[PDB]
Amino acid sequence: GATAATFSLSFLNSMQQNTGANNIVATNQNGYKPGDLVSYQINNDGTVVGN
Amino acid sequence: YSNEQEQVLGQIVLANFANNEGLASQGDNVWAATQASGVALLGTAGSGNF
């Protein structure tokens, strides 16, 4: 029942060269699942960050 | 197996980090990924940087 997310997929910096084999370098996205706080800290610049 | 046939069940993946010293030890000879260590780069043995 969850509506699909429409996202822009970018293949930037991809190169096709004579590698030993095809190698995937990096995959990234800005989504995440629900999660509860497990830790909190204060960084050296004053920021409070919760993990 | 007995029928002179072999089946692959899986390949052990290996991980390498930007900063090995940045890993946080979790006890019982186990490490955890942290910011300092950077994100785990996965791969197979004998290829790439493994």
PDB file of C-alpha atoms in Angstrom:
ATOM      1  CA  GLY A   1       0.000   0.000   0.000  1.00  0.00           C
ATOM      2  CA  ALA A   2       2.954   2.396   0.032  1.00  0.00           C
ATOM      3  CA  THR A   3       3.056   4.842  -2.862  1.00  0.00           C
ATOM      4  CA  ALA A   4       6.207   4.532  -4.958  1.00  0.00           C
ATOM      5  CA  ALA A   5       8.921   7.160  -4.617  1.00  0.00           C
ATOM      6  CA  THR A   6       9.894   9.030  -7.793  1.00  0.00           C
ATOM      7  CA  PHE A   7      13.619   9.765  -7.752  1.00  0.00           C
ATOM      8  CA  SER A   8      16.305  11.045 -10.106  1.00  0.00           C
ATOM      9  CA  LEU A   9      19.084   8.510 -10.705  1.00  0.00           C
ATOM     10  CA  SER A  10      22.453   9.967 -11.731  1.00  0.00           C
ATOM     11  CA  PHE A  11      25.228   8.048 -13.502  1.00  0.00           C
ATOM     12  CA  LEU A  12      27.672  10.967 -13.288  1.00  0.00           C
ATOM     13  CA  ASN A  13      31.444  10.330 -13.350  1.00  0.00           C
ATOM     14  CA  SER A  14      30.846   6.881 -14.859  1.00  0.00           C
ATOM     15  CA  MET A  15      33.613   5.805 -17.219  1.00  0.00           C
ATOM     16  CA  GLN A  16      34.020   2.943 -19.700  1.00  0.00           C
ATOM     17  CA  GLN A  17      37.685   1.941 -19.906  1.00  0.00           C
ATOM     18  CA  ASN A  18      39.875  -1.191 -20.151  1.00  0.00           C
ATOM     19  CA  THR A  19      39.552  -2.353 -16.539  1.00  0.00           C
ATOM     20  CA  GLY A  20      40.343  -5.923 -15.553  1.00  0.00           C
ATOM     21  CA  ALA A  21      36.600  -6.329 -15.170  1.00  0.00           C
ATOM     22  CA  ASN A  22      33.466  -4.244 -14.645  1.00  0.00           C
ATOM     23  CA  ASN A  23      33.611  -2.833 -11.111  1.00  0.00           C
ATOM     24  CA  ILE A  24      30.814  -0.962  -9.334  1.00  0.00           C
ATOM     25  CA  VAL A  25      32.278   1.949  -7.388  1.00  0.00           C
ATOM     26  CA  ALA A  26      29.585   3.696  -5.351  1.00  0.00           C
ATOM     27  CA  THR A  27      25.832   3.655  -4.786  1.00  0.00           C
ATOM     28  CA  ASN A  28      24.091   6.256  -2.653  1.00  0.00           C
ATOM     29  CA  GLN A  29      20.637   7.640  -1.912  1.00  0.00           C
ATOM     30  CA  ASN A  30      18.958   9.992   0.551  1.00  0.00           C
ATOM     31  CA  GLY A  31      16.267   7.682   1.951  1.00  0.00           C
ATOM     32  CA  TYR A  32      16.215   5.861   5.270  1.00  0.00           C
ATOM     33  CA  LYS A  33      13.961   3.709   7.464  1.00  0.00           C
ATOM     34  CA  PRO A  34      12.361   4.780  10.772  1.00  0.00           C
ATOM     35  CA  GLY A  35      14.727   4.534  13.723  1.00  0.00           C
ATOM     36  CA  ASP A  36      14.932   5.531  17.370  1.00  0.00           C
ATOM     37  CA  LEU A  37      17.715   7.396  19.142  1.00  0.00           C
ATOM     38  CA  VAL A  38      20.470   5.080  20.386  1.00  0.00           C
ATOM     39  CA  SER A  39      23.102   7.683  21.274  1.00  0.00           C
ATOM     40  CA  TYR A  40      23.762  11.406  21.526  1.00  0.00           C
ATOM     41  CA  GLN A  41      27.000  13.389  21.508  1.00  0.00           C
ATOM     42  CA  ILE A  42      28.369  16.930  21.446  1.00  0.00           C
ATOM     43  CA  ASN A  43      30.941  17.527  18.725  1.00  0.00           C
ATOM     44  CA  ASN A  44      33.997  19.747  19.157  1.00  0.00           C
ATOM     45  CA  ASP A  45      32.312  22.608  17.250  1.00  0.00           C
ATOM     46  CA  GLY A  46      29.279  22.759  19.555  1.00  0.00           C
ATOM     47  CA  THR A  47      26.926  20.645  17.441  1.00  0.00           C
ATOM     48  CA  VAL A  48      24.646  18.193  19.249  1.00  0.00           C
ATOM     49  CA  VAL A  49      24.272  15.058  17.116  1.00  0.00           C
ATOM     50  CA  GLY A  50      21.972  12.120  17.813  1.00  0.00           C
ATOM     51  CA  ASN A  51      22.778   8.676  16.436  1.00  0.00           C
TER      52      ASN A  51
ATOM     53  CA  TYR B   1      27.254 -33.675  -4.057  1.00  0.00           C
ATOM     54  CA  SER B   2      27.079 -37.363  -5.030  1.00  0.00           C
ATOM     55  CA  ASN B   3      26.114 -36.746  -8.675  1.00  0.00           C
ATOM     56  CA  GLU B   4      29.507 -35.271  -9.635  1.00  0.00           C
ATOM     57  CA  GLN B   5      27.975 -31.791  -9.597  1.00  0.00           C
ATOM     58  CA  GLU B   6      28.974 -28.791  -7.503  1.00  0.00           C
ATOM     59  CA  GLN B   7      26.706 -25.975  -6.341  1.00  0.00           C
ATOM     60  CA  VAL B   8      27.910 -22.558  -5.231  1.00  0.00           C
ATOM     61  CA  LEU B   9      26.202 -21.380  -2.042  1.00  0.00           C
ATOM     62  CA  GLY B  10      27.819 -17.980  -1.558  1.00  0.00           C
ATOM     63  CA  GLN B  11      30.950 -15.876  -1.792  1.00  0.00           C
ATOM     64  CA  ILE B  12      32.501 -14.344   1.315  1.00  0.00           C
ATOM     65  CA  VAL B  13      32.549 -10.570   0.867  1.00  0.00           C
ATOM     66  CA  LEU B  14      35.430  -8.540   2.288  1.00  0.00           C
ATOM     67  CA  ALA B  15      35.407  -4.926   3.457  1.00  0.00           C
ATOM     68  CA  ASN B  16      38.150  -2.297   3.452  1.00  0.00           C
ATOM     69  CA  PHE B  17      38.005   1.112   5.119  1.00  0.00           C
ATOM     70  CA  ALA B  18      39.457   4.542   4.441  1.00  0.00           C
ATOM     71  CA  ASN B  19      40.891   4.673   7.989  1.00  0.00           C
ATOM     72  CA  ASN B  20      41.495   1.331   9.693  1.00  0.00           C
ATOM     73  CA  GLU B  21      42.473   3.116  12.918  1.00  0.00           C
ATOM     74  CA  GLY B  22      39.070   4.833  12.990  1.00  0.00           C
ATOM     75  CA  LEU B  23      37.194   1.588  13.634  1.00  0.00           C
ATOM     76  CA  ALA B  24      35.522   1.223  17.028  1.00  0.00           C
ATOM     77  CA  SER B  25      36.154  -2.137  18.684  1.00  0.00           C
ATOM     78  CA  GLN B  26      33.002  -3.813  20.010  1.00  0.00           C
ATOM     79  CA  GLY B  27      34.694  -6.616  21.958  1.00  0.00           C
ATOM     80  CA  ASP B  28      35.169 -10.322  21.205  1.00  0.00           C
ATOM     81  CA  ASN B  29      37.568  -9.324  18.382  1.00  0.00           C
ATOM     82  CA  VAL B  30      34.807  -7.442  16.531  1.00  0.00           C
ATOM     83  CA  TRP B  31      35.001  -3.967  14.976  1.00  0.00           C
ATOM     84  CA  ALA B  32      32.228  -1.545  14.014  1.00  0.00           C
ATOM     85  CA  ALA B  33      32.027   1.120  11.327  1.00  0.00           C
ATOM     86  CA  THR B  34      32.336   4.682  12.626  1.00  0.00           C
ATOM     87  CA  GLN B  35      32.611   8.090  10.966  1.00  0.00           C
ATOM     88  CA  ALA B  36      36.369   8.134  11.419  1.00  0.00           C
ATOM     89  CA  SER B  37      36.803   4.764   9.702  1.00  0.00           C
ATOM     90  CA  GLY B  38      34.640   5.779   6.761  1.00  0.00           C
ATOM     91  CA  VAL B  39      32.143   3.700   4.867  1.00  0.00           C
ATOM     92  CA  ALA B  40      32.948   0.061   4.132  1.00  0.00           C
ATOM     93  CA  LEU B  41      34.175  -0.617   0.596  1.00  0.00           C
ATOM     94  CA  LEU B  42      33.031  -4.122  -0.319  1.00  0.00           C
ATOM     95  CA  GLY B  43      34.629  -6.585  -2.688  1.00  0.00           C
ATOM     96  CA  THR B  44      35.989 -10.061  -3.301  1.00  0.00           C
ATOM     97  CA  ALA B  45      39.312 -11.624  -2.368  1.00  0.00           C
ATOM     98  CA  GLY B  46      42.117 -11.572  -4.912  1.00  0.00           C
ATOM     99  CA  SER B  47      40.661  -8.650  -6.886  1.00  0.00           C
ATOM    100  CA  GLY B  48      40.893  -4.898  -6.481  1.00  0.00           C
ATOM    101  CA  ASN B  49      42.528  -3.864  -3.206  1.00  0.00           C
ATOM    102  CA  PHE B  50      41.923  -7.142  -1.316  1.00  0.00           C
TER     103      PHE B  50
END
